[PDB]
């Protein structure tokens, strides 16, 4: 609620081919099509092959930026990106070659920030998962075996096994309800009576293992990025050790692409950011273009007013961000620095008219 | 569960009539259907029409409180409210006209406060969003082939394809369970297992973003709204800098119309307010009616009683309202404040039957 | 995880017959049915009608404890307690009058303490449970509609109208997948893709509106029922202000039983209590029996050891509880209190063998 | 996201052995077996048997570490891990006496820490759940009668009872949908409208009952293992009472076998840890292997940069582990303490590839 993500977080044409690229695979997987656009379309792997082969042999090129890097990972699918389509090519030379379109899939797993930031808390925590998956297979074969007790003499086509109720067993379990072999007795029908309240809370607990401590990552992720962007500021000398821990899980800073709007003049204010990288477009008769280093809405946060200009991005702008309260705590976390806001509540009142 | 929301909170008929005005659809909709209630409530529509639109135009009379407003919202389907009925009226010269019912379905939206609070948030976020909807879209495909793998042979009019087994994907992996096509061998069988297991967890982070920082929100929307109510009361040019961003997590502000009750006197005492606007009912031989600015329940707190008077709402008051606990928060926050809850605890004693 | 909750807590015969008392419904309601214990249950009723009926003159003598309460709630369905099956007994003369056995289902909920805590907190956020319901509602037409676009041609007798398609709209959206009426051809297909999407996101939110600020309700009732209980321990007249409301958030109260253990020798030592009322069976040569305002196990954890007693209750004691790290709290929050639970863990160790 | 869990933490092959063994019960169940590989697997439970049975003696042998035990538990099993079978193999002289191949299920259940976590804390807030469960069981009977009002006419052989309609209940209230009895009429098909905006509300709480204090206790039980190693730490005397219940919150211990690796040179600098037992391999010219009781990353930290060693597991070291901010936490704790880290920070640059 209190950040402008901006300039194509979805930017690298990398990442977006898969999806036009692995939908060409259809058509070809259907009968009754003609064979005009069958193969057009297999251009357009070659395309897209091409493409990430045009881009690949300067990706080789690693002696850009050479210094310290760990691209194992990067590289790992654009070796493949290339070869499993090229060998499937002719060793299967019927068109089950296509079916080779699984490989791309990692691509955009390639440039997929928070992706990586998935799996680094699934080995904290996977202590828990197991314990639990057990517990899960526990109650499985617990229960999926109490069929197999009763429906054997009816329905052996359907409960003449162990299985066959396994199979009913997370059918059942996993809040689904498949619809195709169900119980006709009692006792039988009785015992679903703990299954759903039971897995309910089972996936009640796990699935919750799984935002538990994501959610610090996460919300550790907007920390561990901005304690950057900390010292950049001139002001922040005389901030408290401790002060900062409450702050920083707030702060959120993203980039905004030149020309964007920052603020609109007129709407509420209720927000203000720290600039520390870029300038902006602050519109009044003198704008008073800020350059790294600046911020903006103590004119609007103080008198609690709408927006005193339609600032916008003049430059891609790295920007902080932070709504009232916060800043309210700022505020009352210290009189020595409401002291410049409240100086500079007066001076940008003709400092934005003027020069 | 410390809060008084009364006066209408679903007040304005604007946001009323479209669910009655939906409703007229449907009968227009079924064969069988007599002429006679056909048509009558096709004026319903010219009803609601002609209300908005008598509505309308003092809409755009939008000369009352002229000062900063930024109304494309609010406008923005009234426009529509009228014209696309109209239209529709004469080139779908057919009853089908009626189908532009869903035009209205914004008027809601309209006013809705509560969804400009949704989608703030969404603006924040969506890069998680994409990274994980990507995701969702990495798993889909990444698993949907693997059933083409498999029963293409003896299941070509079921999964003889790839988008075929898609479908089976999203029934599958979104908790459902439709029930039409299921596989029949055993290791296409098997892969369900992991699926529900994902799926679960996949929403069981997906929609869990949602509520993540909606809450914060929704918790920040009831500070934002009340740092306003504050510098009201008289009594708190003491209050420390960071003794409020505690207390107005906790505080919500909540009007009562004129004539209801507060609170019912005999009733056990488990909450005391702060009157800031309006005026009260406080019965007892000489009614304590205290106006803008007052509070009531230190009686019932300090001693841990039943209530002493059936305060009711002799005005439309905006309320505040606070439990014990951060009471007792504020009377340990402070000795300097419970000097005077102590007095009053003894004044109101006797105010209350005396004037 | 540090609590000993006992002594019948499901204790009230009032509660208890309609579990019985309802499952005598069932064999009324089937064929086939001889007429031999067809009646013998109809008695079973007039048994617990009588048994109510006994206790309700007995609740009529609402002189007891008669000072001030507020019993509209107790007695509203003893009063329909007996009336409804009677008055059903005659005007219904055929079985169908033990169809009122719907009505004994409040007389669990007569008695439910937790429910009006339930209640309690749905009136502060309906404003939100409303916005979302609507946005519900608006979700519902907004998509419901879109299936009666394409299959009323070819399928009239299924998708032929409005609601049959709002009927596959919540068995879609709300999770469940029935599996009578699905489409056929692709757009109409490809709708679903965000229903899922949605519906999740949407209870996503809805259902943690419920959980949101009721978990608070009973974090917070471990308080409200626990301000008590604190200026019995006579040591408590040192304890700072803010030093309390980190603490009772942790330490809940339960009563144990006579006769029950409270803590067995020689299993590991993970917690403390605070007696308040009632007596002890600290089991040594010589039984340490402490009466109202004692505690143990500071042995046990400053130590970090197994137990030093197999302490049963002697008596119904009200107990208190509390972990080591919250004690570890204590302990660290002040060195003057660690002084007399060092001599203290001097003290009982000599105590405990002699008297 | 912050901890190295290794050495084989699924370690010991007595919870082992019950996922091979208990998938030999299959063969067994399915007609059309050669009786060759049928009774083949049939030692494979002897094995088990007598590989238990092998270790069953020597655990019986509970001289070893006999000081003060509970072992009512561990022992619960073993006793019924060999027997149950053997008198099955006698009076179930037909082949079902391998249907107790369920008992072995709890032998993970016997050496699964993390279950008696689970069993601790539903003996707090099982009031709830009860106060929940009877409440989903008001429910339950409140509307599955509701269905008996209606279709009894046209579907009794579907809907001509109670129960047949609380199948249908919890089929519909618990997120299912099987699919094999649905209504057919308007009023009976609207009562569905509350049901699963009900049940996910139900479940909304109370599998989110399970979650809510499960945390606490798995947050907690990274305290309770973590209030030790923390004495062991020369340096720890300093510390404020308080200062330590913030940090332990995250810092958790996880141990690493010999051999494996710690962190790897290179990679990016983003933890650090506590040793407290066990020595390392710091690769540098000079190894710098440093034992009980050492740490190392603020050269990695205060810096802001990669990696300085290569630092593997040259023995089973019990590890602690801590990111930045809660070192940054530190730091800002103190500046006592950042004075040896800055001093270290300097000494290990030259110490590394020094002695
Ligand atoms: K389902
Ligand atoms: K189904």
């Given at each position: 609620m ?9 930017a690298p ?8 690229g692995?939908?060409a ?19 357009l ?6 493409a990430?082969?045009?881009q690949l042999?300067?990706t080789?090129?690693?002696?850009r930026?050479?210094?310290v ?7 790992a699918?654009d ?6 389509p090229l ?11 296509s079916?080779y379109?699984?490989?791309w899939?990692?691509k ?7 992706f990586?930031?998935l799996?680094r808390?699934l ?6 998962l ?6 899960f297979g526990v109650?499985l ?6 069929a197999?007790v009763?429906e054997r003499?009816?329905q052996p086509?359907?409960f003449?096994?162990?299985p066959?109720?396994?199979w009913?067993a ?5 809040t689904?309800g498949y619809?195709?072999?169900?119980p006709q007795?009692?006792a ?6 703990a299954?759903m309240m039971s ?7 796990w ?8 959610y610090?990552?996460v919300?550790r992720?907007?920390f561990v990025?901005?304690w950057?962007?900390?010292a950049?500021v ?6 408290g050790?401790?002060?900062l ?9 993203r980039?905004?692409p030149?020309?964007?709007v920052?603020?609109r003049?007129?709407?509420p ?7 520390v ?5 602050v519109?009044t ?13 103590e004119?609007?946060?103080?008198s609690?007013?709408?927006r ?5 991005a003049?430059?891609?702008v790295?920007l902080?961000?932070?709504?009232s309260?916060?800043?309210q705590?700022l505020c009352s ?17 003709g400092?934005?008219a003027?020069?």
């Amino acid at each position: 609620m209190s950040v402008l993500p901006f300039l194509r977080i979805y930017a690298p044409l990398n990442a977006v081919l898969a999806a036009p690229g692995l939908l060409a695979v259809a058509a070809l997987t259907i009968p009754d099509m003609s064979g005009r656009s069958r193969l057009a379309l297999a251009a357009l792997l070659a395309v897209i092959w091409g493409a990430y082969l045009l881009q690949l042999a300067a990706t080789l090129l690693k002696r850009r930026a050479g210094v310290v890097r760990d691209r194992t990972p990067k590289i790992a699918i654009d070796v493949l990106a290339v070869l499993v389509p090229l060998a499937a090519f002719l060793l299967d030379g019927s068109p089950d070659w296509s079916l080779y379109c699984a490989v791309w899939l990692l691509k955009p797993l390639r440039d997929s920030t928070f992706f990586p930031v998935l799996g680094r808390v699934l080995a904290n925590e996977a202590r828990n998962l197991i314990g639990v998956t057990t517990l899960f297979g526990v109650v499985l074969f617990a229960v999926a075996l109490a069929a197999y007790v009763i429906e054997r003499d009816i329905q052996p086509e359907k409960f003449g096994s162990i299985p066959q109720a396994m199979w009913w067993a997370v059918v059942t379990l996993s809040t689904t309800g498949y619809g195709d072999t169900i119980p006709q007795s009692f006792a039988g029908r009785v015992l679903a009576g703990a299954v759903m309240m039971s897995g309910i809370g089972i996936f009640g607990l796990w699935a919750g293992i799984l935002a538990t401590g994501f959610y610090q990552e996460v919300r550790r992720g907007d920390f561990v990025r901005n304690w950057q962007l900390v010292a950049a500021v001139p002001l922040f000398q005389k901030l408290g050790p401790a002060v900062l821990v409450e702050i920083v899980r707030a702060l959120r800073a993203r980039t905004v692409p030149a020309g964007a709007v920052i603020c609109r003049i007129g709407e509420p204010g209720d927000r203000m950011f720290f600039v520390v990288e870029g300038s902006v477009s602050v519109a009044t008769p003198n704008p008073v273009e800020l350059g790294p280093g600046a911020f903006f809405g103590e004119m609007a946060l103080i008198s609690g007013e709408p927006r005193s200009a339609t600032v916008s991005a003049a430059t891609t702008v790295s920007l902080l961000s932070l709504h009232s309260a916060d800043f309210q705590m700022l505020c009352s976390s210290s009189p020595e620095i409401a002291e410049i806001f409240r100086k500079t509540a007066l001076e940008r009142r003709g400092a934005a008219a003027s020069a």
